Amino acid sequence: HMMVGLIWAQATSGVIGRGGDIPWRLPEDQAHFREITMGHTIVMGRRTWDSLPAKVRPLPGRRNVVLSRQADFMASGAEVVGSLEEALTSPETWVIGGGQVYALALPYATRCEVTEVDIGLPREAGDALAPVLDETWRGETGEWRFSRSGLRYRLYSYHRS
Numbered sequence: 734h735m736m737v738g739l740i741w742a743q744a745t746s747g748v749i750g751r752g753g754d755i756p757w758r759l760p761e762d763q764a765h766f767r768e769i770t771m772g773h774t775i776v777m778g779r780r781t782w783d784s785l786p787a788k789v790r791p792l793p794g795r796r797n798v799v800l801s802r803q804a805d806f807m808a809s810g811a812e813v814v815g816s817l818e819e820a821l822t823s824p825e826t827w828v829i830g831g832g833q834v835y836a837l838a839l840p841y842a843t844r845c846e847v848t849e850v851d852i853g854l855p856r857e858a859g860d861a862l863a864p865v866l867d868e869t870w871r872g873e874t875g876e877w878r879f880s881r882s883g884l885r886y887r888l889y890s891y892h893r894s
């Protein structure tokens with residue numbers, strides 16, 4: 734049984750953070766992200782891996798896998814694979830970005846963990862949007878919470894079988 738999960742953070746506009754490209758300051762999201770993914774395999778694209786801050790490259794305490802079709806691409810502290818199917822060896826796999834990988838992994842996913850940030854961030858050219866969730870996703874919607882940054886945010890935990 735190879736369970737796939739997706740986890741991301743988005744503005745209310747749907748615009749998602751990708752790797753180190755995160756425009757909002759929301760410290761609690763990192764603790765939330767770590768609580769979900771710790772002790773599991775995490776899968777990310779090349780562009781996401783590249784945009785990671787060097788201090789968190791690779792991400793500590795987790796089996797890092799990078800999805801790249803470029804055959805010459807290497808990355809210290811992570812396993813590179815050329816197919817998403819090859820990355821889903823573990824019993825629980827979390828896909829952590831970016832947009833292209835989300836879309837590839839979405840048909841396989843049975844869980845989505847979403848952080849929505851209450852911040853004005855219009856869609857602009859080059860921005861990735863959150864994967865669209867259809868009526869198959871069963872979801873518990875969290876209450877707006879105030880971050881110590883001053884921003885409001887809430888947690889969505891979606892699932893399907």
Ligand SMILES: CCc1nc(N)nc(N)c1OCCCOc1ccccc1CCC(=O)O
Nearest residue numbers: 740741742752753762763766789829830848
């Ligand atoms: C916390 C950011 C984040 N939050 C959620 N809910 N989903 C993501 N896919 C996500 O991005 C994960 C990849 C980027 O991760 C970082 C980007 C900049 C600084 C620190 C981290 C995470 C470091 C860590 O997890 O130890």
